[PDB]
Amino acid sequence: HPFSVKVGLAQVLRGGAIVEVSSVNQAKLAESAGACSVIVSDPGGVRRMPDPVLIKEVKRAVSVPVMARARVGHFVEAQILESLAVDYIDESEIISVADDDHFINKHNFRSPFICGCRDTGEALRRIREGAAMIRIQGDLTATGNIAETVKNVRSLMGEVRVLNNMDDDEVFTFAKKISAPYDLVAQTKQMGRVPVVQFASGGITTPADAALMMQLGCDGVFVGVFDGPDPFKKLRSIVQAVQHYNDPHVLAEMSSGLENAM
Amino acid sequence: PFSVKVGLAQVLRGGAIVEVSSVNQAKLAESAGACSVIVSDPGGVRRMPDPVLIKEVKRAVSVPVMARARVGHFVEAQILESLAVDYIDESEIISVADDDHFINKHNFRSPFICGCRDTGEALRRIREGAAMIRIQGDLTATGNIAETVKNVRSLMGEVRVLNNMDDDEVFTFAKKISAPYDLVAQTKQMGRVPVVQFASGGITTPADAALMMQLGCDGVFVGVFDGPDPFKKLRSIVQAVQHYNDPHVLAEMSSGLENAM
Amino acid sequence: HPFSVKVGLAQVLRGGAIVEVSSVNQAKLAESAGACSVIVSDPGVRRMPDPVLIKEVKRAVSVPVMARARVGHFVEAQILESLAVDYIDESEIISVADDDHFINKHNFRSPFICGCRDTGEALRRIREGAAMIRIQGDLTATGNIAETVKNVRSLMGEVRVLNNMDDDEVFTFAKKISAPYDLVAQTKQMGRVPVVQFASGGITTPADAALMMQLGCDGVFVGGPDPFKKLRSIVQAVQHYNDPHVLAEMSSGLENAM
Amino acid sequence: HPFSVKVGLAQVLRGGAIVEVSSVNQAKLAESAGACSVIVSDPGGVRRMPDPVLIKEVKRAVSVPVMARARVGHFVEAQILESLAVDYIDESEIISVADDDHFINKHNFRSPFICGCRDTGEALRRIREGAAMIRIQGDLTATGNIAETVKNVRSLMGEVRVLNNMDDDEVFTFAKKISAPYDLVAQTKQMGRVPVVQFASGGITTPADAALMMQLGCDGVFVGVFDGPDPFKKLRSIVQAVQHYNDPHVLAEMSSGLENAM
Amino acid sequence: PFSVKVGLAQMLRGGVIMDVVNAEQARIAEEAGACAVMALERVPADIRAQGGVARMSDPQMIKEIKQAVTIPVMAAARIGHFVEAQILEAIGIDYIDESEVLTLADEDHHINKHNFRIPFVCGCRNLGEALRRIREGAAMIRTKGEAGTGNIIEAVRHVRSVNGDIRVLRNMDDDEVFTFAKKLAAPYDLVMQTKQLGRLPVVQFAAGGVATPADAALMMQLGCDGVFVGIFKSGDPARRARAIVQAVTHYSDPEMLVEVSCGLGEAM
- For chain B, domains (ranges, CATH) are 1-261 (3.20.20.70)
CA distance E215 to chain B (A): 34
With a CB cutoff of 8 Å and minimum separation 6, the contacts of A227 are A142, A262
* E160: chain C residues, CB-CB within 8 Å: 169
- C173 within 8 A of C165, measured Cβ to Cβ: yes
| Chain E residue with Cα closest to C215 | E173
CA pair distance D145, D16, nearest whole angstrom:
20
DSSP B61: -
Whether chain C has a CB inside 8 Å of the CB on D182: the answer is yes
Q: How far is CA C34 from the centre of its chain?
A: 17
Question: Which of E106, E131, E175 is most worth mutating to test chain B (most B CB atoms within 10 A of its CB)?
Answer: E175
Rounded Cα distance, B4 and A257, in Å:
61
Alpha helices in chain E (DSSP H): 2-10, 23-30, 44-50, 59-66, 82-91, 127-136, 153-170, 177-184, 188-197, 213-222, 237-249, 254-260
Mark residue D259 as left, alpha or beta (left: phi above 0; alpha: psi -120 to 50; beta: remaining).
left
Calpha distance A201→A210 (Å, rounded): 9
Using CB atoms, pick whichever of D56, D77, D83 lies closest to residue E255: D83
For residue C252, list chain B residues with Cβ-Cβ distance below 8 A. 50-52, 55
Q: Cβ contact (<8 Å) for E173 and C161? A: no
The answer to whether E115 contacts chain A (CB < 8 Å) is no
Residues of E in contact with B177 (CB under 8 A): none
CA–CA–CA angle E259, E261, E263 (5° rounding):
100
As a whole number of angstroms, the distance between CA D246 and CA D262 comes to 25
In whole angstroms, what separates CA C163 from the centre of its chain? 24
Give whole-number Cα distances, D84 to A65, D56, D89, D91, in Å.
Answer: 76, 7, 11, 16
Q: Which run of H or E residues covers position A79? A: helix A75-84
End-to-end distance of chain E based on CA atoms, in angstroms? 41
DSSP B49: P
Integer CA distances (angstroms), D134 to A210, C144, D87, in order: 62, 51, 16
| Residue of chain C whose alpha carbon sits nearest to that of B98 | C146
Beta-carbon separation of E170 and C164 below 8 A: yes
Task: Give the integer Cα–Cα distance in Å for C57 and C50.
Answer: 11
CA distance C76 to C49: 9
Report the distance separating Cα D167 and Cα A258, nearest Å.
Answer: 80
CA distance E171 to chain C (A): 6
C160–E167 C-beta distance less than 8 A: no
Q: What is the resolution of this structure in A?
A: 2.5
φ/ψ of residue C87, rounded to 5: -145, 150
Q: How many CB atoms lie within 10 A of CB E183?
A: 11
The percent helix, strand, coil of chain D (3-state, each to 5) is 45, 15, 40
CA-CA distance, B132 to E75, in Å (whole number)? Answer: 47
CA angle C69, C72, C74 (to 5 degrees): 70
Flag whether residue C210 sits within 8 Å of chain B, measured between CB atoms.
yes
Is chain C touching chain A, with at least 3 CB–CB pairs below 8 Å?
Answer: no
B187 closest CA partner among B138, B111, B116, B139: B116
A124-163 residues touching B, CB cutoff 8 A: 154, 157-158, 161-162
Alpha carbons within 13 A on the beta-carbon side of B13: 10
- Comparing C-alpha atoms, which of D11, D18, D20 is closest to residue D50? D20
Interface touch E171/C166, C-beta < 8 Å? no
Distance (Å, whole) CA E202 – CA E113: 14
Identify which of C153, C163, C166 has the shortest CB distance to residue E171: C163
Per-residue burial over A14-31, b if 16 or more Cβ lie within 10 Å, else e, is: eebbbbbbbeeebbebbb
Cβ atoms < 10 Å from Cβ of A56: 15
DSSP 8-state secondary structure symbol assigned to residue D52: H
Nearest CA in chain C to E173: C157
C-alpha dihedral sign at A91, A93, A99, A100:
positive
What gap in Å lies between CA C2 and CA C106, rounded to an integer? 9
Specify whether domain E1-268 bears CATH 1.10.357.10: no
In what helix (H) or strand (E) does residue A163 lie, and over which residues does it extend?
A: helix A147-164
Q: What contacts C2, CB < 8 A, 6 or more positions away?
A: C109
Residue E209 region by backbone torsions, left for phi larger than 0, else alpha for psi between -120 and 50, else beta: left
Instruction: Count contacts between B and C (CB, < 8 Å).
Output: 68
Give C-chain residues touching E171 at CB under 8 angstroms.
160-161, 163-164
Q: Which residues of A make CB contacts under 8 Å with E?
A: 143-147, 150-151, 154, 205-206, 208-209, 211-212, 215, 245, 248-249, 251-252, 255-258, 261-262
Minimum Cα–Cα distance from C254: chain B residue: B50
- Residue D44 class from Cβ within 10 Å (0-12 exposed, 13-18 middle, 19+ buried)? exposed
In chain E, what residues touch D46 (CB-CB under 8 Å)? Answer: 149-151, 211, 268
Task: Output helix, strand, coil percentages for chain B, rounded to the nearest 5.
Answer: 45, 15, 40
- Kindly determine whether residue E107 and residue A144, on different chains, have CB atoms separated by under 8 Å: no
Question: What's the CA dihedral at D223, D228, D232, D235 to 10 degrees?
Answer: -30
Listed in sequence order, the DSSP H helices in chain B are: 2-9, 23-30, 51-59, 74-82, 119-128, 146-163, 170-176, 181-190, 206-214, 230-242, 247-254
Closest residue to A158, CB basis, from B160, B163, B166: B166
d(CA D187, CA D183): 6
Q: Shortest Cα distance from C112 to chain B (angstroms)?
A: 29
Touching partners of D (3+ C-beta pairs < 8 Å): C, E
Contacts of E149 in chain D (CB under 8 A): 46
Euclidean distance between CA atoms C251 and C245, whole angstroms = 10
Rounded to whole angstroms, the Cα distance separating E6 from E198 reads 17
Chain E contact probe: residue of A256, A259, A260, A262 with most E CBs at under 10 A: A256
Least CB–CB distance from E108: residue in A154, A258, A262: A154
Interchain contact D76–C (C-beta under 8 A): no
> Testing the interface with E: which of D22, D79, D96 to mutate, by most E Cβ within 10 A?
D79
Chain B's closest residue to C249, CA to CA, is: B51
User: Which H or E run contains A231?
Assistant: helix A231-243
Closest CA to E139 of E97, E108, E105, E109: E97
Give B47→chain C minimum CA distance, Å: 9
Cα separation, A24 vs A30, in Å, equals 10
Measure B177 CA to nearest chain E CA, in Å.
9
Of C153, C156, C161, the CB nearest to E168: C161
Which of C246, C222, C226 minimizes the C-alpha distance to C236? C246
Q: Rounded to whole angstroms, how far apart are CA atoms E254 and E220?
A: 13
Residue B254 identity: S
With a CB cutoff of 8 Å and minimum separation 6, the contacts of A173 are none
Are there at least 3 beta-carbon pairs closer than 8 Å between A and D? no
Q: Which residues sit opposite B39 in a β-bridge?
A: B20, B67
d(CA B95, CA B43): 10
Which distant-in-sequence residues (6+ apart) come within 8 Å of D203 by Cβ? D138, D139, D143, D144, D145, D146, D147, D148, D149, D209
Following DSSP, what letter does each residue of chain C receive, concatenated?
A: -HHHHHHHHHTTTTT-EEEEESSHHHHHHHHHTT-SEEEE-------S--HHHHHHHHHH-SS-EEEEE-TT-HHHHHHHHHTT-SEEEE-TTSPPS-SS----GGG-SS-EEEEESSHHHHHHHHHHTEEEEEE---SSS----HHHHHHHHHHHHHHHHHHHS-GGGHHHHHHHTT--HHHHHHHHHHTS-SSEEEE-S---SHHHHHHHHHTT-SEEEE----HHHHHHHHHHHHHTTT-HHHHHHHHTT-----
- Contact across the interface for C247 and B79, Cβ inside 8 Å: yes
Q: Helical H runs in chain D?
A: 2-10, 25-33, 52-61, 75-84, 120-129, 147-164, 171-178, 182-191, 207-216, 231-243, 248-254
Search chain E and give the residue with CA nearest C173. E164
Chain B positions touching E135 (Cβ under 8 A) are 171, 181
Please name which of B31, E58, B184, D57 lies closest in space to residue A256, comparing C-alpha atoms: E58
DSSP class of A247: -
Name the β-bridge partners of A131.
A113
Binary contact (B166, A161; C-beta < 8 A): yes
CB D18 within 8 A of CB D220: yes
Asked if residue D164 lies in contact with residue D182, where contact means CB atoms within 8 angstroms, the answer is: no
Q: Are the Cβ atoms of E82 and B128 closer than 8 angstroms?
A: no
> For residue E218, what is the nearest residue in chain D, using CA coordinates?
D76
Set of chain A residues whose Cβ sits within 8 Å of the Cβ of B166: 157-158, 161
Judge whether E101 and E48 are in contact, CB under 8 Å: no
Are D136 and D99 contacting, i.e. CB atoms less than 8 angstroms apart? no
Report whether D223 contacts D238 (CB < 8 A): yes
What single letter denotes the amino acid at residue B233?
K
Cβ pair C169:D75 closer than 8 A: no
Q: Give the Cα separation of A26 and A37 in Å (integer).
A: 12
**Is A248 in contact with E87 (Cβ distance < 8 A)?**
yes
How many beta-carbon pairs below 8 A join chains C and D?
47
